Amino acid sequence: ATPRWTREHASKIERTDETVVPIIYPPREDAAPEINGWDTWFLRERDGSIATVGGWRVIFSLTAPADLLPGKRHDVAEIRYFYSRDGETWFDGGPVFEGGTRGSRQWAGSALLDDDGRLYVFYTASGRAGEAEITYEQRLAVGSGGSVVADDDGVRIEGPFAHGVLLEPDGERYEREEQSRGMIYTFRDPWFFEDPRSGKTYLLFEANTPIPEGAGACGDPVWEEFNGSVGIAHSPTGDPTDWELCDPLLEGICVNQELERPHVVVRNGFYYLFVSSHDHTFAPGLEGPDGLYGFVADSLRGEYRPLNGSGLVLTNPANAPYQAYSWVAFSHREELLVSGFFNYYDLGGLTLDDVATLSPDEQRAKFGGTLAPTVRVALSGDRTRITGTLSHGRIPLESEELPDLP
Numbered sequence: 001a002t003p004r005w006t007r008e009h010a011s012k013i014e015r016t017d018e019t020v021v022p023i024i025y026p027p028r029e030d031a032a033p034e035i036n037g038w039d040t041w042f043l044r045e046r047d048g049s050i051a052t053v054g055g056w057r058v059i060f061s062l063t064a065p066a067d068l069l070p071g072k073r074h075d076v077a078e079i080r081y082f083y084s085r086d087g088e089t090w091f092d093g094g095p096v097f098e099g100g101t102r103g104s105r106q107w108a109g110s111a112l113l114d115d116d117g118r119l120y121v122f123y124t125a126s127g128r129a130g131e132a133e134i135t136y137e138q139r140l141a142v143g144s145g146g147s148v149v150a151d152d153d154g155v156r157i158e159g160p161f162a163h164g165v166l167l168e169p170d171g172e173r174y175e176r177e178e179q180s181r182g183m184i185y186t187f188r189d190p191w192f193f194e195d196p197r198s199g200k201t202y203l204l205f206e207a208n209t210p211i212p213e214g215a216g217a218c219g220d221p222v223w224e225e226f227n228g229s230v231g232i233a234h235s236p237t238g239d240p241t242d243w244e245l246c247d248p249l250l251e252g253i254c255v256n257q258e259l260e261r262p263h264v265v266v267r268n269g270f271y272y273l274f275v276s277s278h279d280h281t282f283a284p285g286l287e288g289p290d291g292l293y294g295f296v297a298d299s300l301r302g303e304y305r306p307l308n309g310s311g312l313v314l315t316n317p318a319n320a321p322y323q324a325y326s327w328v329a330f331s332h333r334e335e336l337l338v339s340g341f342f343n344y345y346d347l348g349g350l351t352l353d354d355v356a357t358l359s360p361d362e363q364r365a366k367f368g369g370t371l372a373p374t375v376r377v378a379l380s381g382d383r384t385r386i387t388g389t390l391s392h393g394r395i396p397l398e399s400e401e402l403p404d405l406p
């Protein structure tokens with residue numbers, strides 16, 4: 001009996017002063033002017049803390065050339081890494097992988113620097129390598145056996161990498177491309193997670209739960225097409241490359257198709273599950289914004305209930321509604337910090353579909369492709385509140401003091 005994000009929940013979704021981030025203004029100069037970057041994740045230790053190699057943090061982004069049309073970046077996404085000594089001033093480390101990477105292009109995942117010093121970069125293999133025309137087949141892959149070397153000058157990630165597919169949908173608990181009714185199926189965004197209570201090793205991902213035709217599982221057959229779910233796999237050995245599929249943590253059946261970049265933050269006794277979702281991926285009769293949605297339980301595989309009653313944790317203002325996306329939450333002392341990327345801004349009133357109308361120059365003019373100002377939020381049980389922001393893409397360590405709040 002999988003925990004459900006229900007239509008009764010989504011009906012309550014509504015922008016409030018506690019969930020709306022300030023307006024994002026473009027940062028004064030870019031770390032890589034030639035490159036657009038989105039969907040970023042942190043190099044973490046096994047426990048989940050941000051990894052530090054000779055005083056450097058490492059982060060990973062999906063990247064495309066800046067001269068490319070924003071709407072098309074997803075077809076040629078390549079994983080680059082960046083490194084920083086403070087958490088503000090990031091240096092471009094270049095592409096992480098030299099070749100032998102799975103899929104026509106790579107989508108978001110996670111990064112593990114294991115106790116043994118071995119590097120695992122989990123990613124989504126979209127399509128198949130050297131395919132004729134672009135396909136939308138997603139499988140959870142890993143580039144294993146990496147090395148992270150750090151001097152006083154910077155960080156280089158050195159090869160060779162052993163690329164292999166880890167998981168594909170079973171067709172019973174997790175929908176395959178064949179079973180996809182309505183929009184394209186999801187099976188992506190593999191996020192590594194060691195449960196600090198059990199010690200057991202898991203891998204979360206975004207999937208869909210298959211719904212048979214005429215299942216009656218919803219109060220209207222078209223609602224059944226919106227079958228988004230947060231899937232999880234287990235490693236009995238704790239080997240980061242050996243996984244068995246488990247039952248999904250949470251489903252948004254009749255509510256939403258895309259429960260994107262799922263991840264868990266554990267805070268005192270409690271498991272907060274966070275997913276980023278779109279306005280256009282909501283089932284008909286429901287109205288929610290592009291935002292970070294969140295749920296809480298007393299255990300990793302517990303009865304998740306939505307934060308703030310509706311599930312909406314954080315969103316953009318009505319007058320800049322696509323300015324950020326692909327938020328990733330992480331603990332810092334008594335605060336929760338949330339890092340998205342700077343998405344589409346200065347649309348005036350145009351919808352995202354309408355941005356494909358405009359001249360190439362006018363399209364690139366309305367896309368950030370940098371890290372958003374990281375949001376500071378305060379959790380209090382099943383309730384959240386925005387407390388303020390930091391500099392663009394500040395990822396601080398727990399050993400660092402943050403500025404005071406108003």
Ligand SMILES: OC[C@H]1O[C@@](CO)(OC[C@@]2(O[C@H]3O[C@H](CO)[C@@H](O)[C@H](O)[C@H]3O)O[C@H](CO)[C@@H](O)[C@@H]2O)[C@@H](O)[C@@H]1O
Nearest residue numbers: 038039074077107108188189258260278325326343352
């Ligand atoms: O797709 C690769 C990579 O991007 C992710 C998260 O950004 O999906 C993004 C997605 O939406 C993009 O395009 C929409 C407009 O349709 C825009 O509103 C949004 O800001 C963009 O991120 O792009 C694909 C399109 O098929 C969808 O999967 C998703 O809605 C993520 O899934 C992945 O790591």
